[PDB]
Amino acid sequence: KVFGRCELAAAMKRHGLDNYRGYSLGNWVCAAKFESNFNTQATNRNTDGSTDYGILQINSRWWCNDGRTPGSRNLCNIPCSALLSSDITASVNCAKKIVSDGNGMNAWVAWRNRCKGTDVQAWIRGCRL
Numbered sequence: 001k002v003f004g005r006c007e008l009a010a011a012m013k014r015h016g017l018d019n020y021r022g023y024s025l026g027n028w029v030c031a032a033k034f035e036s037n038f039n040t041q042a043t044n045r046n047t048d049g050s051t052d053y054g055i056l057q058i059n060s061r062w063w064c065n066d067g068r069t070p071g072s073r074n075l076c077n078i079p080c081s082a083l084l085s086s087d088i089t090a091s092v093n094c095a096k097k098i099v100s101d102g103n104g105m106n107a108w109v110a111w112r113n114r115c116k117g118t119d120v121q122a123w124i125r126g127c128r129l
Contacts, residue, residue: 012032
């Protein structure tokens with residue numbers, strides 16, 4: 001599923017990301033944009049052999065299991081295919097785990113580079129929320 005902008009806002013807010021750990025709903029709907037292009041089935045291999053999976057591109061080395069990245073931790077205790085479904089639940093639940101891990105939303109390099117500091121609010125513009 002390739003989420004709508006105002007569709008992924010609604011679903012993220014409902015699952016409890018708005019202001020989660022002090023991060024405004026625009027922070028999340030900006031990270032998703034530059035991470036997955038609102039595509040749930042966005043997958044991206046990193047050089048170290050691990051893969052980023054889903055709407056938020058969650059790493060298989062730490063968070064989820066794919067059985068092809070030795071040193072997998074699976075700290076979210078889910079298969080990384082869980083993370084590509086049209087239901088953003090598993091993504092959001094794991095993402096709550098990551099953004100609480102220490103460096104907050106800096107865990108997503110896209111967000112660090114392309115969202116952090118900017119007018120994130122512009123991402124929930126027009127959304128009947």
